[PDB]
Structures are given as structure tokens and as C-alpha cells.
Coordinates of all heavy atoms in Angstrom, one line a residue:
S1 N 5.6 62.7 85.6 CA 6.4 63.9 85.6 C 6.5 64.4 84.2 O 7.2 63.8 83.3 CB 7.8 63.6 86.2 OG 8.5 64.7 86.3
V2 N 5.9 65.5 83.9 CA 5.9 66.1 82.5 C 7.3 66.3 82.1 O 8.1 67.0 82.8 CB 5.0 67.3 82.4 CG1 5.1 67.9 81.1 CG2 3.6 67.1 82.9
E3 N 7.7 65.9 80.9 CA 9.0 66.2 80.3 C 9.2 67.7 80.3 O 8.3 68.5 80.0 CB 9.1 65.7 78.8 CG 9.1 64.2 78.7 CD 7.8 63.4 78.5 OE1 6.8 64.0 79.0 OE2 7.8 62.3 78.0
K4 N 10.3 68.1 80.9 CA 10.5 69.5 81.4 C 10.3 70.5 80.2 O 11.0 70.4 79.2 CB 11.8 69.7 82.0 CG 11.9 71.1 82.7 CD 13.2 71.2 83.5 CE 13.5 72.6 84.0 NZ 12.2 73.3 84.7
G5 N 9.3 71.4 80.4 CA 9.1 72.5 79.5 C 8.1 72.1 78.3 O 7.8 73.0 77.5
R6 N 7.6 70.9 78.3 CA 6.8 70.5 77.2 C 5.3 70.6 77.4 O 4.8 70.5 78.5 CB 7.1 69.0 76.8 CG 8.6 68.7 76.6 CD 9.2 69.4 75.4 NE 10.6 69.3 75.5 CZ 11.5 69.9 74.6 NH1 11.1 70.4 73.6 NH2 12.8 69.7 74.9
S7 N 4.6 71.0 76.4 CA 3.2 71.1 76.4 C 2.5 70.3 75.2 O 3.2 69.7 74.4 CB 2.8 72.6 76.3 OG 3.1 73.1 75.0
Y8 N 1.2 70.5 75.2 CA 0.4 69.8 74.2 C 1.0 69.8 72.8 O 1.1 68.8 72.1 CB -1.0 70.4 74.2 CG -1.9 69.9 73.1 CD1 -2.4 68.6 73.1 CD2 -2.3 70.7 72.1 CE1 -3.3 68.1 72.1 CE2 -3.2 70.3 71.1 CZ -3.7 69.0 71.1 OH -4.6 68.6 70.1
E9 N 1.3 71.0 72.3 CA 1.9 71.2 71.0 C 3.1 70.4 70.7 O 3.3 69.9 69.6 CB 2.2 72.7 70.8 CG 0.9 73.6 70.8 CD 0.4 74.0 72.2 OE1 1.0 73.7 73.3 OE2 -0.7 74.6 72.2
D10 N 4.0 70.3 71.7 CA 5.2 69.4 71.5 C 4.8 68.0 71.3 O 5.4 67.3 70.4 CB 6.1 69.5 72.8 CG 6.6 70.9 73.0 OD1 7.4 71.4 72.2 OD2 6.3 71.5 74.0
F11 N 3.9 67.5 72.0 CA 3.4 66.1 71.8 C 2.7 65.9 70.5 O 2.8 64.8 69.9 CB 2.6 65.6 73.0 CG 3.4 65.6 74.3 CD1 3.4 66.6 75.2 CD2 4.3 64.5 74.5 CE1 4.1 66.6 76.4 CE2 5.0 64.4 75.7 CZ 4.9 65.5 76.6
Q12 N 1.9 66.9 70.1 CA 1.2 66.9 68.8 C 2.3 66.7 67.7 O 2.0 66.0 66.7 CB 0.3 68.1 68.6 CG -0.4 68.1 67.3 CD -1.5 67.1 67.1 OE1 -1.4 66.1 66.3 NE2 -2.6 67.4 67.7
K13 N 3.5 67.4 67.8 CA 4.5 67.2 66.8 C 5.0 65.7 66.8 O 5.3 65.2 65.7 CB 5.6 68.2 67.1 CG 5.2 69.6 66.8 CD 6.2 70.7 67.2 CE 5.8 72.1 66.8 NZ 6.7 73.1 67.2
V14 N 5.1 65.1 67.9 CA 5.6 63.7 68.0 C 4.5 62.9 67.3 O 4.8 62.0 66.4 CB 5.8 63.2 69.4 CG1 6.4 61.8 69.3 CG2 6.8 64.2 70.1
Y15 N 3.2 63.0 67.7 CA 2.1 62.4 67.0 C 2.2 62.5 65.5 O 2.1 61.5 64.8 CB 0.8 63.0 67.5 CG -0.5 62.4 66.9 CD1 -1.3 61.6 67.5 CD2 -0.8 62.8 65.5 CE1 -2.5 61.0 66.9 CE2 -1.9 62.2 64.9 CZ -2.7 61.4 65.6 OH -3.9 60.9 65.0
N16 N 2.4 63.8 65.0 CA 2.5 64.0 63.6 C 3.6 63.3 62.9 O 3.4 62.7 61.8 CB 2.6 65.5 63.3 CG 1.4 66.3 63.6 OD1 1.4 67.6 63.6 ND2 0.3 65.7 64.0
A17 N 4.8 63.2 63.5 CA 5.9 62.5 63.0 C 5.6 61.0 62.9 O 5.8 60.4 61.8 CB 7.1 62.7 63.8
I18 N 5.0 60.4 63.9 CA 4.5 59.0 63.9 C 3.5 58.8 62.7 O 3.7 57.8 61.9 CB 3.9 58.6 65.2 CG1 5.0 58.7 66.3 CG2 3.4 57.1 65.1 CD1 4.4 58.5 67.7
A19 N 2.5 59.7 62.6 CA 1.5 59.6 61.6 C 2.0 59.7 60.2 O 1.6 59.1 59.3 CB 0.4 60.6 61.9
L20 N 3.0 60.6 60.0 CA 3.5 60.8 58.7 C 4.3 59.6 58.2 O 4.3 59.2 57.1 CB 4.4 62.1 58.6 CG 3.7 63.4 58.6 CD1 4.7 64.5 59.0 CD2 3.0 63.7 57.3
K21 N 5.1 59.0 59.2 CA 5.8 57.8 58.9 C 4.9 56.6 58.6 O 5.2 55.7 57.8 CB 6.8 57.5 60.0 CG 7.8 56.4 59.6 CD 8.8 56.1 60.8 CE 9.8 55.0 60.3 NZ 10.6 55.3 59.1
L22 N 3.8 56.5 59.4 CA 2.8 55.5 59.1 C 2.3 55.6 57.7 O 2.0 54.6 57.0 CB 1.6 55.6 60.1 CG 1.7 55.1 61.5 CD1 0.5 55.5 62.4 CD2 1.8 53.5 61.4
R23 N 2.0 56.8 57.2 CA 1.6 57.1 55.9 C 2.6 56.6 54.9 O 2.3 56.0 53.9 CB 1.2 58.5 55.7 CG 0.9 59.0 54.3 CD 0.8 60.5 54.2 NE -0.4 61.1 54.9 CZ -0.5 62.4 55.1 NH1 0.3 63.2 54.7 NH2 -1.6 62.8 55.7
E24 N 3.9 57.0 55.1 CA 5.0 56.7 54.2 C 5.3 55.2 54.1 O 5.5 54.7 53.0 CB 6.3 57.3 54.7 CG 7.5 57.1 53.8 CD 8.6 58.0 54.2 OE1 9.1 57.9 55.4 OE2 9.1 58.8 53.4
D25 N 5.2 54.4 55.2 CA 5.7 53.0 55.2 C 4.6 52.1 55.0 O 4.2 51.2 55.8 CB 6.4 52.7 56.6 CG 7.7 53.5 56.7 OD1 8.3 54.0 55.7 OD2 8.3 53.6 57.8
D26 N 3.9 52.3 53.9 CA 2.7 51.6 53.7 C 2.8 50.1 53.1 O 1.8 49.4 53.0 CB 1.7 52.4 52.8 CG 2.1 52.5 51.4 OD1 3.2 52.4 51.0 OD2 1.2 52.9 50.6
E27 N 4.0 49.7 52.8 CA 4.2 48.4 52.3 C 4.5 47.3 53.3 O 4.4 46.1 53.0 CB 5.5 48.4 51.3 CG 5.3 49.3 50.1 CD 6.0 48.9 48.9 OE1 7.2 48.4 49.0 OE2 5.5 49.1 47.8
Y28 N 4.8 47.7 54.6 CA 5.1 46.8 55.6 C 4.0 45.7 55.8 O 2.8 46.0 55.8 CB 5.3 47.5 56.9 CG 5.5 46.6 58.1 CD1 6.7 45.9 58.4 CD2 4.4 46.5 59.0 CE1 6.8 45.1 59.5 CE2 4.5 45.7 60.1 CZ 5.7 45.0 60.4 OH 5.8 44.2 61.5
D29 N 4.4 44.5 55.9 CA 3.6 43.3 56.2 C 2.5 43.2 55.1 O 1.3 43.1 55.4 CB 3.0 43.5 57.6 CG 2.7 42.1 58.2 OD1 2.9 41.1 57.6 OD2 2.1 42.1 59.4
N30 N 3.0 43.0 53.9 CA 2.1 42.9 52.8 C 1.1 43.9 52.7 O -0.1 43.6 52.6 CB 1.6 41.4 52.7 CG 2.7 40.4 52.4 OD1 3.4 40.5 51.4 ND2 2.9 39.5 53.3
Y31 N 1.5 45.2 52.8 CA 0.7 46.3 52.7 C -0.3 46.6 53.8 O -1.3 47.4 53.6 CB 0.0 46.4 51.3 CG 1.0 46.1 50.1 CD1 1.2 44.9 49.6 CD2 1.7 47.2 49.6 CE1 2.1 44.7 48.6 CE2 2.6 47.0 48.6 CZ 2.9 45.7 48.1 OH 3.8 45.5 47.1
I32 N -0.2 46.0 55.0 CA -1.0 46.3 56.1 C -0.5 47.7 56.7 O -1.4 48.5 57.2 CB -0.9 45.2 57.2 CG1 -1.5 44.0 56.7 CG2 -1.5 45.7 58.5 CD1 -1.3 42.8 57.6
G33 N 0.8 48.0 56.7 CA 1.4 49.1 57.3 C 1.7 48.8 58.8 O 1.3 47.7 59.2
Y34 N 2.3 49.8 59.4 CA 2.8 49.6 60.8 C 1.7 49.9 61.9 O 2.0 49.7 63.0 CB 4.0 50.5 61.1 CG 5.3 49.9 60.5 CD1 5.7 50.2 59.3 CD2 6.1 49.1 61.3 CE1 7.0 49.7 58.8 CE2 7.3 48.6 60.9 CZ 7.7 49.0 59.6 OH 9.0 48.5 59.1
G35 N 0.5 50.3 61.5 CA -0.5 50.7 62.5 C -0.8 49.6 63.5 O -0.7 49.8 64.7
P36 N -1.1 48.4 63.1 CA -1.4 47.3 64.0 C -0.2 46.9 64.9 O -0.5 46.7 66.1 CB -1.8 46.1 63.1 CG -2.4 46.8 61.9 CD -1.5 48.0 61.7
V37 N 1.0 46.8 64.4 CA 2.1 46.4 65.3 C 2.4 47.5 66.3 O 2.8 47.2 67.4 CB 3.4 45.9 64.5 CG1 4.1 47.1 63.8 CG2 4.3 45.1 65.4
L38 N 2.1 48.7 66.0 CA 2.2 49.9 67.0 C 1.2 49.7 68.1 O 1.4 50.1 69.3 CB 2.2 51.2 66.4 CG 3.4 51.6 65.5 CD1 3.2 53.0 65.0 CD2 4.7 51.4 66.2
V39 N 0.0 49.3 67.7 CA -1.1 49.1 68.8 C -0.7 48.0 69.7 O -0.8 48.1 70.9 CB -2.4 48.8 68.1 CG1 -3.4 48.4 69.1 CG2 -2.9 50.1 67.3
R40 N -0.2 46.9 69.1 CA 0.3 45.7 69.9 C 1.4 46.1 70.8 O 1.4 45.7 72.0 CB 0.6 44.5 69.0 CG 0.7 43.3 69.8 CD 1.3 42.1 69.1 NE 0.8 40.9 69.9 CZ 1.5 39.8 70.2 NH1 2.8 39.7 69.8 NH2 0.9 38.8 70.8
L41 N 2.4 46.9 70.3 CA 3.5 47.4 71.2 C 3.0 48.1 72.4 O 3.4 47.8 73.5 CB 4.4 48.2 70.3 CG 5.7 48.7 71.1 CD1 6.5 47.6 71.8 CD2 6.6 49.6 70.2
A42 N 2.1 49.1 72.1 CA 1.6 49.9 73.2 C 0.9 49.0 74.2 O 1.0 49.3 75.5 CB 0.7 51.0 72.7
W43 N 0.2 48.0 73.8 CA -0.5 47.1 74.7 C 0.5 46.2 75.5 O 0.4 46.0 76.6 CB -1.6 46.3 74.0 CG -1.7 44.8 74.2 CD1 -1.6 43.9 73.2 CD2 -2.1 44.1 75.4 NE1 -1.8 42.6 73.7 CE2 -2.1 42.7 75.0 CE3 -2.3 44.4 76.7 CZ2 -2.5 41.7 75.9 CZ3 -2.7 43.4 77.6 CH2 -2.7 42.1 77.2
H44 N 1.5 45.6 74.8 CA 2.5 44.7 75.4 C 3.3 45.5 76.4 O 3.8 44.9 77.5 CB 3.3 43.9 74.4 CG 2.6 42.7 74.0 ND1 3.2 41.5 73.5 CD2 1.3 42.3 74.1 CE1 2.4 40.6 73.3 NE2 1.2 41.1 73.6
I45 N 3.6 46.7 76.2 CA 4.5 47.5 77.2 C 3.7 47.8 78.4 O 4.2 48.0 79.5 CB 5.2 48.7 76.5 CG1 4.1 49.7 76.0 CG2 6.1 48.3 75.4 CD1 3.9 50.8 76.9
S46 N 2.3 47.8 78.3 CA 1.4 48.1 79.4 C 0.9 46.9 80.1 O 0.6 46.9 81.3 CB 0.2 48.8 78.8 OG 0.5 50.0 78.1
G47 N 0.8 45.7 79.4 CA 0.2 44.5 79.9 C 1.0 43.7 80.8 O 0.5 42.7 81.3
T48 N 2.3 44.1 81.0 CA 3.1 43.5 82.1 C 2.8 44.0 83.5 O 3.3 43.5 84.5 CB 4.6 43.9 81.8 OG1 4.7 45.3 81.9 CG2 5.1 43.4 80.5

């Protein structure tokens, strides 16, 4: 069920906010950044 009134551009804005924060928070986990833990989160919420 599409979030009411939302389209591609709205989700692209969410993508962009995630991506900008990924760029900013580059020191996490001895400079790995949050990319990997976000991939693992998406998999663990799905893998149940």
C-alpha cells in the first residue's frame, strides 16, 4: 500500500538523506562507515 500521496521523487529524497548521512558519518567502525551495517539490517529484517 503506497504511502498516501507519495511518488518516486519523495522516495528519492529519503534515499538522498540516507546517502548524505552515509557520506558524513565516515568514521564509524574504524572508518568503514555505516554502509555494511545498513545492508545487514535490510537483510535481517527480511530474512525472518
Side-chain angles (χ1 to χ4, degrees):
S1 185
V2 180
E3 289 90 337
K4 188 171 171 48
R6 306 293 167 183
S7 69
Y8 173 70
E9 296 79 7
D10 294 298
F11 295 98
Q12 178 74 251
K13 289 174 179 178
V14 183
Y15 176 108
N16 290 173
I18 298 167
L20 285 164
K21 193 181 176 59
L22 278 172
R23 174 191 289 171
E24 182 172 59
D25 291 345
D26 70 338
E27 299 208 322
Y28 172 79
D29 204 2
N30 294 301
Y31 309 95
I32 294 172
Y34 281 90
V37 73
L38 293 181
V39 172
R40 196 188 201 224
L41 178 57
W43 135 242
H44 274 205
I45 61 102
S46 301
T48 59

